[PDB]
Write a protein that binds this ligand. Structure first.
Ligand SMILES: *[C@@H]1O[C@H](CO)[C@@H](O)[C@H](O)[C@H]1NC(C)=O
Ligand SMILES: *[C@@H]1O[C@H](CO)[C@@H](O)[C@H](O)[C@H]1NC(C)=O
Ligand SMILES: *[C@@H]1O[C@H](CO)[C@@H](O)[C@H](O)[C@H]1NC(C)=O
Ligand SMILES: *[C@@H]1O[C@H](CO)[C@@H](O)[C@H](O)[C@H]1NC(C)=O
Ligand SMILES: [Ca+2]
Ligand SMILES: [Ca+2]
Ligand SMILES: [Ca+2]
Ligand SMILES: [Ca+2]
Ligand SMILES: [Ca+2]
Lengths: 388, 323, 478, 98
């Protein structure tokens, strides 16, 4: 990447490691997990790091295990503004044949609904865990080979581990390392026209298949042509200088100009597209400080404070009740409050004196002496001290 | 025919290409006309708060003349003088009223002294355009097809589908105005019902009926004779529109403003004629004829002599020279 | 109400089974293999289990067609994608496994299309390894190179130079003609077909080169290699996202750091990381001109190309158009525009879609000067849209291995009974060719090769210069 | 440089009769302002205007090649299936024939 390293060094990609020996990096070829990404209006990323766009309005199949049937994911697209070139995601439906043949549904908020029943988070069933992440985004985790992300305003993600190498099929592709075969319709033949690929995965026949995927919706709204240039010109400005040599910015720039000209409010469409880039720069190692009072700094409530890179392990009051559990989480970005204060259910965060206990799910107050005949339990400062 | 006509006359009112009126007190920019499959141009109308300001023509991606009630025609952000002729858009004044011709692209916009947008548009866009002035078809009932494509019964949420925002201002859904007329009714409907009625009674208007119907025009006036206090002149905006709408159909009317007690506003020296030629013989002009076979246009002009010189009528004896 | 038609029967949601997959999960031919959601059925009328809906007709058998490009195909019908046939006997397409012949390119001044298919931007001014075989752990037969001068910003400047190094040879080309600086040993495989606007140029059983005399470099390789090469064109493995493996054996993400790894002279200037933008230098803050160029590059999406746009995506070849002719200051020669469209038309021709896009007010391409040396104007040379490149001539009478089906350019056409020679520009009767047939067998028109090196005792050599029925004596080793 | 075709080996005969300095100032002016992309006509038409004036004074000129302002004439010889090939680009032929 245009800089020198001495011999013997070992720089590491996200995927694997490489070592310099005789002016030639030696590298391993061990597989590493993929990420299908939905975001913005209609902007997809396959597992094989392909980018494209398909603005159809039906229930499309996003992903599926296709040699066995451990799961299946189903996106549901709708038009999302006055324009016709604005088709955002409303909901996604997950299906686990391993447990009851159930049917999870991530709704347009941060809500989840199993089999029609709304649910309070967390949801530790046997395999699948569903919990908030920053208290503004849901995260499904089935087993150790599947993750998800929030489908409230339409930024679905997935994490498929290499045990699914090449054995999945959908809009997101085969997950085989080859970027070119991803336009493979279910009839087993690669299509060159994206307008044919997506409309082959629709689940309903009544839905209208589209004939052209447009590239410049700023023609129908020439007022936003100027603003869409200077707005996402910061994406190539040196504010993001640190991760041009980590991921190609040229598409994340291409997906901005389609979002800012198309959606109802180009304020947040702008600031949900710049974050699509920083969230990928951060997935490789580079964190960027791109927030300003002008460039969309979020408003953490009075109890909380903004924070760039922090630990979501010692935040929630449920942590003190279950301390022995492992938190093998990263250094995330969001709204926290200082280390003396821990997060309460009612939005405020409090010291650990009035931090309640969550014994057996039941929310006990900071001083609750409590006993059957044989056991003896009390809540001191977040933890539930039981005896016998 | 081979042409069309839209009009945004008076306050908040609209007249599409096909005999369909309504009211709309917008809050921001909105699309008047323009293609729908592919846009070579787009005529745009900015509203401050119900009352209109500017007409705008964005010629694809690269150009934007900005005329308005403000009259100080600007472009992009740099205020330019007037006349102006860049990119095949002659921005002239005709009959004391401002014009924006685009004959290469197939449209002729203009504004009057009071502020009344008008859009004459060719038959090349028959069945093609869609916007706030409706499609140019024969029918007049289907011409609310939203930006998605949806025949809507409401004349209001339609016009709010065709909104277009910028970076300087993002705009929301305007609300229909809460009419104060509903309590201040009084005598105002009894004595003033006649100025709307004289579209039907008087003989000078009693002959466009086989061409148009005044029933919408009388319908749209009676709701606006009630907010203005103490004036018969409140009827002549909805009436002035009826004059032009019959003129465009191929049957012009004459001398209707003699007894109507309302003449449209114009600067000093001139008053409202009817069917004056656009090629006004001015002072610093070349005495050439039989090239201006254009159709006849309404607007205010000078007296019989009193040639034009820089926006004022001056006597032919005092024609200056230039160097 | 409406009693539904005979061929199907109405359904009713049972109050017990949650799995009331009835009307909502209406299985058509698209969504049979696909798995469907359902809350409960409806008061509809659904086909039996043994059949499905098909465009307002409940087609009975599971014989319903096999879609491609949004078009019907009955079972048994075939389609030809590439060099493979593929039939939908059943409901899925069933294709062969004959990997086809890949093709680099240099679309414009500074772009490169790899074998597996990856357009990328690399403006350079040094000499660069386009493709070679000496890669890691291999013998190293051929080392095609490429070299540009004054070509970081496309313009009427940027003449290319190409030095190809096969079989210990050095044949190179620039300024229109091809030059041999060192002839190679096995002259039998060598061949040069100056047919039309191109210089087709074979070098072996599994190698070929094409050159439009101006900038394009389209080397064609066969099935033989399959991950034996590397360079700016990548490794030719099918995997499409490992074509940025630099010389130092790692994948890079920024192509401007890739080609800098493949320069020959390790002390010339490495090119500069340009700030990314949708507008090149001339089109930078000239939004007027940026639309006149965009519109004129929509010829790639026009009524005359509609057939090819369904096969070959034009979005790669459009980005090159806007990039080149912004930077290019076209004044007298509109070649930095007319050459990016011809590069798309030729790819459309290889897939069997000949096109006539060239008129008198757009990229004219006359052919009248060849019909000038003769005082009598015979008028045999003509611009033909896409004519075969591999024909028979006095110099090459036999049929050659033909990597290119057809090519644009000026082609000589005259009635039969006459064969073309290039030195005498017109076509001439066959007997006037300096053709050779020594001791009976059919072969070329006297190639300058020493046949039979193998056996000394059977050293029975018979050359032929132009016409002579001669045979030479072998010098004994003893 | 490209407008110095007006002062080239092929025009030396006419440069002695007709001053090229007027017709050169037009060349530099037009094709700067002109954004020639597909049609190089804002350049090829300023030289033809000089060649025609050179022709009126009896100096016919052939300045037009295949890499500079080609001007094919093959489409008129197309409506007939049999290609008779009578239409040709002629440098300066009489305009008033029968
Ligand atoms: C009105 O015109 C003035 C003078 O040209 C200009 O400064 C102003 O921005 C215009 N306002 C509107 C609402 O168009
Ligand atoms: C308008 O265009 C539509 C769609 O092409 C066509 O179906 C219809 O017949 C046209 N109507 C008129 C009045 O031309
Ligand atoms: C393809 O067709 C061949 C020949 O009929 C048959 O032998 C084979 O099983 C088919 N394969 C697939 C994948 O359908
Ligand atoms: C084009 O070339 C082909 C192949 O040589 C020939 O068969 C055909 O007649 C030519 N057509 C024209 C229009 O010259
Ligand atoms: Ca794949
Ligand atoms: Ca209508
Ligand atoms: Ca590869
Ligand atoms: Ca064939
Ligand atoms: Ca003479």
């Amino acid at each position: 990447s245009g800089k020198r390293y001495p011999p013997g060094t070992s720089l590491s990609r996200d995927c694997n490691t490489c070592i310099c020996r005789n002016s030639q990096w030696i590298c391993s070829n061990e597989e590493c997990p993929g990420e299908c990404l939905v975001t913005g209006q209609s902007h997809f990323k396959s597992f094989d790091n392909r980018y494209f766009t398909f603005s159809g309005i039906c229930q499309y199949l996003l992903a599926r295990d296709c040699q066995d049937h451990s799961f299946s994911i189903v996106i549901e697209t709708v038009q999302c503004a006055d324009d016709r070139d604005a088709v955002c995601t409303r909901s996604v439906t997950v299906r686990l044949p391993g447990l009851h043949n159930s049917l999870v549904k991530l709704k347009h908020g941060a809500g989840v609904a199993m089999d029609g029943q709304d649910v309070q988070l967390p949801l530790l069933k046997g395999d699948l865990r569903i919990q908030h992440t920053v208290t503004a985004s849901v995260r499904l985790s089935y087993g150790e080979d599947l993750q998800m992300d929030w489908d409230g305003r339409g930024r679905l993600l997935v994490k498929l581990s290499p045990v699914y190498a090449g054995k999945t099929c959908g809009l997101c592709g085969n997950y085989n390392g080859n970027q070119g075969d991803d336009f493979l319709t279910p009839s087993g033949l690669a299509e060159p026209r994206v307008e044919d690929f997506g409309n082959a995965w629709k689940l309903h026949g009544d839905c209208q298949d589209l004939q052209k995927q447009h590239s410049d919706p700023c023609a129908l709204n020439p007022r936003m042509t100027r603003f869409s240039e200077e707005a996402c010109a910061v994406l190539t400005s040196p504010t993001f200088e640190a991760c041009h040599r980590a991921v190609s910015p040229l598409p994340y720039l291409r997906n901005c100009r389609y979002d800012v000209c198309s959606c109802s409010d180009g304020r947040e469409c702008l600031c949900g597209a710049l974050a699509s880039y920083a969230a990928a720069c951060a997935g490789r190692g580079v964190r960027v400080a791109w927030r300003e009072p002008g460039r969309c700094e979020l408003n953490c409530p009075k109890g909380q404070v903004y924070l760039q890179c922090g630990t979501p392990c010692n935040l929630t009051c449920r942590s003190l009740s279950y301390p022995d559990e492992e938190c093998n989480e990263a250094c995330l970005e969001g709204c926290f409050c200082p280390p003396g204060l821990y997060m309460d259910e009612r939005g405020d965060c409090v010291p650990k004196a009035q931090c309640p206990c969550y014994y057996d799910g039941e929310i006990f107050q900071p001083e609750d002496i409590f006993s059957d005949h044989h056991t003896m339990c009390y809540c001191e400062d977040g933890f539930m001290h039981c005896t016998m | 025919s081979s042409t069309a006509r839209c009009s945004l006359f008076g306050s908040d009112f609209v007249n599409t290409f096909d005999g369909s009126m309504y009211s709309f007190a917008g809050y921001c920019s909105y699309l008047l006309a323009g293609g729908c499959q592919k846009r070579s141009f787009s005529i745009i109308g900015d509203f401050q708060n119900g009352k209109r300001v500017s007409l705008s023509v964005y010629l694809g991606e690269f150009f934007d003349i900005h005329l308005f009630v403000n009259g100080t025609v600007t472009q992009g952000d740099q205020r330019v003088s007037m006349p102006y002729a860049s990119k095949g858009l002659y921005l002239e004044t005709e009959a004391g009223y401002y014009k924006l011709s685009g004959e290469a692209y197939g449209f002729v916009a203009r504004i009057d002294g009071s502020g009344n947008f008008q859009v004459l548009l060719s038959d090349r866009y028959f069945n093609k355009t869609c916007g706030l002035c409706g499609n140019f078809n024969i029918f007049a009932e289907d011409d609310f097809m939203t930006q998605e494509g949806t025949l809507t019964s409401d004349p209001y949420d339609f016009a709010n589908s065709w909104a277009l925002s910028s970076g300087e201002q993002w705009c929301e859904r305007a609300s229909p105005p809460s009419s104060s007329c509903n309590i201040s009714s009084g005598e105002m409907q009894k004595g003033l019902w006649e100025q709307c009625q004289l579209l039907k009674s008087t003989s000078v208007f009693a002959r466009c009926h086989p061409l148009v119907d005044p029933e919408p025009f009388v319908a749209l006036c009676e709701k606006t004779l009630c907010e203005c206090a103490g004036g018969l002149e409140c009827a002549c905006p909805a009436l002035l529109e009826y004059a032009r709408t019959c003129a465009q159909e191929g049957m012009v009317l004459y001398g209707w403003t003699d007894h109507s007690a309302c003449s449209p506003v114009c600067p000093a020296g001139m008053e409202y004629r009817q069917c004056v030629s656009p090629c006004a013989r001015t002072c610093q002009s070349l005495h050439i004829n039989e090239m201006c076979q254009e159709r006849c246009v309404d607007g205010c002009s000078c007296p019989e002599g009193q040639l034009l010189d820089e926006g004022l009528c001056v006597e032919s004896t005092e024609c200056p020279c230039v160097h | 109400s409406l009693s539904c038609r005979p061929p199907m029967v109405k359904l009713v949601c049972p109050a017990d089974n949650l799995r009331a997959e009835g009307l909502e999960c209406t299985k058509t031919c698209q969504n049979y293999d696909l798995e469907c959601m359902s809350m409960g059925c409806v008061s509809g009328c659904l086909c039996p289990p043994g059949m499905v809906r098909h465009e307002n007709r409940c087609v009975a058998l599971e014989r319903c067609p096999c879609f491609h490009q949004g078009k019907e195909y009955a079972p048994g019908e075939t389609v030809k994608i590439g060099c493979n046939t593929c039939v939908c006997q059943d409901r899925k397409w069933n294709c062969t496994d004959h990997v086809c012949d890949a093709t680099c390119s240099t679309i414009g001044m500074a772009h490169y299309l790899t074998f597996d298919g990856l357009k990328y931007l690399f403006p350079g001014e040094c000499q660069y390894v386009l493709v070679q075989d000496y890669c890691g752990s291999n013998p190293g037969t051929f080392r095609i190179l490429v070299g540009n001068k004054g070509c970081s910003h496309p313009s009427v400047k940027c003449k290319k130079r190409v030095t190809i190094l096969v079989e210990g040879g050095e044949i190179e080309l620039f300024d229109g003609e091809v030059n041999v600086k060192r002839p190679m040993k096995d002259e039998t495989h060598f061949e040069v077909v100056e047919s039309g606007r191109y210089i087709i140029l074979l070098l072996g059983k599994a190698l070929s080169v094409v050159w439009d005399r101006h900038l394009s470099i389209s080397v064609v390789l066969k099935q033989t290699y399959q991950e034996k090469v590397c360079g700016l064109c990548g490794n030719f493995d099918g995997i499409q996202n490992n074509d940025l493996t630099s010389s130092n054996l790692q994948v890079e993400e920024d192509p401007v750091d890739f080609g800098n790894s493949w320069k020959v002279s390790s002390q010339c200037a490495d090119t500069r990381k340009v700030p990314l933008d949708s507008s090149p230098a001339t089109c930078h803050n000239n939004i007027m001109k940026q639309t006149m160029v965009d519109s004129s590059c929509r010829i790639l999406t026009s009524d005359v190309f509609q057939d090819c746009n369904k096969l070959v995506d034009p979005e790669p070849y459009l980005d090159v158009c806007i990039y080149d002719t912004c930077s290019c200051e076209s004044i007298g020669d509109c070649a930095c525009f007319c050459d990016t469209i011809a590069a798309y038309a030729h790819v459309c021709a290889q897939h069997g879609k000949v096109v006539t896009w060239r008129t008198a007010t757009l990229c004219p391409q006359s052919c009248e000067e060849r019909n000038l040396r003769e005082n009598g104007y015979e008028c045999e040379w003509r611009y033909n849209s896409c004519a075969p490149a591999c024909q028979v001539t006095c110099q090459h009478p036999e049929p050659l291995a033909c990597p290119v089906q057809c090519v644009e350019g000026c082609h000589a056409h005259c009635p039969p009974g006459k064969i073309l020679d290039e030195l005498l520009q017109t076509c001439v009767d066959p007997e006037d060719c300096p053709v050779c047939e020594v001791a009976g067998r059919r072969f070329a028109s006297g190639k300058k090769v020493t046949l039979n090196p193998s056996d000394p005792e059977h050293c029975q050599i018979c050359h032929c210069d132009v016409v002579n029925l001669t045979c030479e004596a072998c010098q004994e080793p003893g």
